[model samples]
Target chain A: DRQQLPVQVFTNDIENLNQTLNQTQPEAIEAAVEAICRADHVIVVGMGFSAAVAVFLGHGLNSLGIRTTVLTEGGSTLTITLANLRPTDLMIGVSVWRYLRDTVAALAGAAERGVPTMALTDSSVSPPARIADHVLVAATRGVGHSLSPVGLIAVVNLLLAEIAVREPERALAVLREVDRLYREQ
Target chain B: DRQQLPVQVFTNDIENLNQTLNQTQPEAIEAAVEAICRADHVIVVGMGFSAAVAVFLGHGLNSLGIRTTVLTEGGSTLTITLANLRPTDLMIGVSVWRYLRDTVAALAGAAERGVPTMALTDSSVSPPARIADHVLVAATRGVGHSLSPVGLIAVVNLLLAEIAVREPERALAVLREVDRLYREQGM
Candidate 1:
């Protein structure tokens, strides 16, 4: 009786997740996975909502033994690191509806400096999409002018899960260490 | 072919989300929502992956006109802000499997100091669950040893959406202002 909008939003999130899995191309997934594996430094760029999603991926990739740097607010230590990105570095920019200029600026900076780039966004025509070499689109449609994060977070989770499959031996060791540290803590 | 593991995890996430909507209690949801509206300060506390989740909720609640403070690490500024817990303040602590001790310590301290506490966790018996006045449980089961955050994130989203329903006019104004600011950002 009292539960209405919440259920509606949650339902929308589930449907969006299904749409994302069906809509995202295999090439984008595989290419992004390969890019992360091959890169010397995996830099994830996002702002606000996307930053949290970026952090989730950064933490997951690190747990998988791939060191990842997340740039949300142009933190100079790493944004400054993007100043001279080599071919070996990868910058993955994430933005949904009403894209942030900082995300575009940071991603564009990486591309201009020769870093391999990937764009995780809702539309193929978003600014990040235009700038990135690889584009992974997700269903970001939300209830009433809001952007649902379900697709973005689930997609990143999928990416990490795929990386785990690709590097089973590496994952096992990392998880073991993760287990040890959590247990110790 | 190349999308197997990612697909499986995603599929599991969807199924788990379905299960969560059916499993979570209405009393828990309503109680937590009511508590949030009534509180002077809405503090969302989480750590690690949960920290990201906390920030998402914190940002959402703020956009809805609720001033929210998120404490992920024990950053002395706001966390130290937890030192004198007023009955007017509400502390919502979120943690999943292998729950971090800091999340527990902070939540517990708030309750002891008389602040209303809500626990968003997997198990009803989790430390936060035991300490908090309101317990909001989400299905946190994941692939292998991982804790899938689908339920936690979805449940939080649902909460925000429900708040929007409760405060439609408030939301419209905030969102309008939000739109104005974002447009100014060319966002």
Candidate 2:
């Protein structure tokens, strides 16, 4: 039972790679990267499975000297939650298969505030994708109810790694503080 | 730049699969499964990168018939924090990459309470590996300072899937409730 489990899951995950690669738009990703570089702050929002993904990217950005806020929950009035939005702010919303209404609202809420918005969605026609200033689509094809995070998580790491390379001097300073804090801990 | 980023990270992640597969032991995994299946409750602990992983697994287990508690912080006096430990309880500590010291204390504290412990570690001789009653090893090799979670996350899903398959009748009943709860939310 333990033996077959990994093979089954791994195969399902690896098989989705072609779909992930095929659907990914390089120009759009480049567009998203430029938007992130221009922004002074980032609002990363997602829920459930995507929440873990948000932290994965948000924490990396924070460590790289970009003040990134990850909000998993959007209360009754998301506008109030995002009140102090800066002119150079960017909001990135992640929504996969189920397309949670809350994350979609966050993206719309940011757009209303005139903040640049990027979306990581399952489809080009997805709600967040339609409204986002920049859209990076990923394949959420899976074997069952659980959407394989293989594609999305890889992209999250890739984008953060890109920022680190493009802004090395800034990232290095914050990284030094991170290294110092960990050592002191 | 966009093209290279995925290629680099994906290559690093894909390369680790062989190492992860080689080190994974069926016997240890089976042993861990039996312990989990027998337990009335489970305490899952991990921090930093592993914290997200604990939720990924714990939430699934909770969705199934298991009552799982996930703790990212060990806090002060870790033993007291883990009070009311049951004999049939299981504590799983996930520590990868740099292996945060706080996770080690959680596993050690669980051991002190005579609770059964399982560890998801990156090495055969890792600190968590040495103390755990059952050890599931995975490769945390990386191209950069960031530890690629590819191997660990895949195994996490695989393990949860196995638990679901082996305990189907038990899981289905809870799945019904989950479906109901989600439907009510208009999810």
Candidate 3:
């Protein structure tokens, strides 16, 4: 009770493992490519842990010249609902039930305004999928049925490669620039 | 609770007020100033509400030149203390009590190793003052001996300003450079 944990402590070995897995995940890359190519104004909606992933997607889009917004529940309002959502807008819903209401509402509202909606989750029966234009089931082999909530994050990270590969030239440019900055810093 | 709170009716004027306050807080500016005058390696230790202030100071120092590590109750251990702190590192202690067991332990550990120490506190008592090289009493003015926390923050800001005035040219240059970069990023 009295002792402290300094940080998450991502070891070199864990990072090495992640890099190896990235080389093996091709489907994840394709999904991200399709998502990025099919959308213009991207709005990612999620609840709790999934919300963090939505923020990461927004950051990725911002880096790649795509306009994006990651909206939390408190950030959602009718003013946001009434805002102009063009056909070019893509709403990505992220939830695992028990907390999918906001994601559902946003998707429904966006659809009413003729915005394309997509759902990313373990269950295809999730609410966002009910009205979403498309749904991507995250294939989890080992820990999907486990008590731990770790496997889904691996799936989410893979999904980013889709967006990365969709615009290979743009992605490569960003990667080289980022790599140069990292080496210099 | 809902009845007592006023409805947040967003208007152009109200939005502008929020933007102005967010952009122009003197404490935030002073926090940046104090950070530049600090040593290369720094430690900030505090508890309670003061712990939050210590974290804010650490972040401010990161934005400036100094790299600071913060130690709260259940956060840092003794092993991860900053490098380059052998003889000339700075330790900033923020505490309402002026001296608590862990706060005293941190200060004493730094002292035994010859690290310079400063403190932000309400009391001028012997506990923390005995160990500190410089004791900054957060100035307080009140009708009923109230050591208003606001005044303590005001004093902290003043301390930052005092440090900034010593090296005005360098501070101004960095500020201007970062300000231009911030605007370019649409901040």
Candidate 4:
């Protein structure tokens, strides 16, 4: 067939994502938000492509006064980061496909310590899924190297949007400060 | 209201986006793709929120074997970067709201020099829109502090996907090599 592979892959990914999101239980989203609000800190972990998404998520949450931290394989040791978590903290692991070792390990350690953990992954049995107390799933379909992160990013955005709504006053203050800092520069 | 502000805003944005994409002209996406294909190099520019999007785009395009560069106000001077652009190069400016000054200047200068320019902006009247040869628009709607890059990112992905399709063989090779490097590095 002479079909456009990237377009084909992307459109298909979106279609699948639509279905997945439609099926995503409202309770899961609510539980995730509740955990985030209950925690004093949120730690995010990922590797490779997912690491970039983690950083972006961490940045958004941090800027909004969520007090989030991102731990990438190349940045900090997962063990060191997990060792610092308390019962009041939440750990979010973002992984897709094969899943990252350090990310899974981080989630496992958190769950073992009774620290509430959540996962934004591609499937239910993904390594992170094995340990996280809660799971959010998305599709990461692709053609060769053009893996679509759009689905993952969308899910992350939804979580963020929910958090922002739950804490409007804090969110507004953080936004104003961010805007002010931008103007200052 | 007892409703959560973020949930309401995001739901509205998504609903609007669904309608917008359904009506989006394929020609606009094709035009953006054509410009990307013709360019020997791709330069992405943005500031603050948009800059983060640009960096993510640059990472995606470059990993796929496309020679792409990103310029941010805090990093490099746009004029200095623009000076190195050749006639065969294409510059993409990502912006929203009032638009960032350096990004606008870079696109304006590129346009004047015969270097083809494109914009992934929030409006046709945005600063980059005035100078860019082609433009693809997206809404940056958000609540208070949550300026979503989801729409802009979706547009950029479409362009990247089109590029990969245009040159399937090249894309596959680049992707395989990138995977090899990542695996070798234990990432």
Between 1 and 3, whose lDDT is larger? 1
Cα shift from native, residue B104, model 2 (Å): 0.5
Per-model TM-score of chain B: 0.89, 0.90, 0.62, 0.88
In Å, residue A158's CA in model 1 sits off its true spot by 1.8
Model 3 C-alpha lDDT per residue in residues B1-187, reported as the tens digit of each score: 5553243322333443343334344554455345436576788877544666677767655544456788764212443353335665788777665345566666666777788776665555646657776665543322233233554455445554565567667557667878898889745
Steric clash pairs (candidate 3): A29-A162, A32-A162, A32-A163, A33-A162, A33-A163
Q: Which ten residues in a row have the lowest lDDT in candidate 4 chain B?
A: B71-80
Local error of candidate 1 at A120, Å? 0.7
Task: Supply DockQ values for each candidate.
Answer: 0.02, 0.02, 0.02, 0.02
Taking the true A–B contacts (Cα pairs closer than 8 Å), what share appears in each candidate? Answer: 0.00, 0.00, 0.00, 0.00
Task: List residue ranges in candidate 4 displaced over 4 A.
Answer: A1-3, A74-76, B1-187
lDDT of 3 at B74: 21
What total of clashing residue pairs does each candidate reach?
A: 1, 0, 5, 1
Q: Against the true structure, what is each candidate's TM-score?
A: 0.50, 0.50, 0.40, 0.48
Off by over 4 Å in 3: A1-32, A63-65, A75-82, A139-149, A179-185, B1-187
lDDT of 3 by residue, A69-158 (tens): 776442213225437677777887776645446577777887788777777665567677677776655433322232222334555555
What lDDT is reached at residue A14 by model 4? 81
Candidate 2 residue B96 Cα shift, in angstroms, is: 1.8
Query: Can you rank all candidates by TM-score, best first?
Result: 1, 2, 4, 3
